[PDB]
Amino acid sequence: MEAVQNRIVEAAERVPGVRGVIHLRARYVGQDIWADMIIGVDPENTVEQAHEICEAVQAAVCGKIRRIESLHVSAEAREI
């Protein structure tokens, strides 16, 4: 679980356009992980581009951690 969270954050931070993981909430349900994450993104990204980054994060994270059964990713403005 601290393992799962570390893996989740690491995978999300490899996605281009992610500026950090701001919040992560994750729980086991049986052998399954349910998770909700907020990523930081460039304030000057369009909402569409931010949505594409979230979509990429969702795909990257689920691809790297097969136990995740459900993951929601949204984005908030964050400065480098």
Add this chain to the structure above:
Amino acid sequence: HMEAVQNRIVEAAERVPGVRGVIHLRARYVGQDIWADMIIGVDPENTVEQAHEICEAVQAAVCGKIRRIESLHVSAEARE
């Protein structure tokens, strides 16, 4: 009272420029007061920081029109 309040939250939010409808609304009583979370639609081509300014404006408009609202979080998604 809760259904009348929900329709008033929706109408207050929908008069703020740049709001393209309310995608999701959740409202719960915590005390006598209402705590709420909403997702508004916005222009996909707005920047994230522009979207954030719209959400902040929806938060003020709704909380100024409904005194029983104690807490409201507003987040935006791309909509046509």
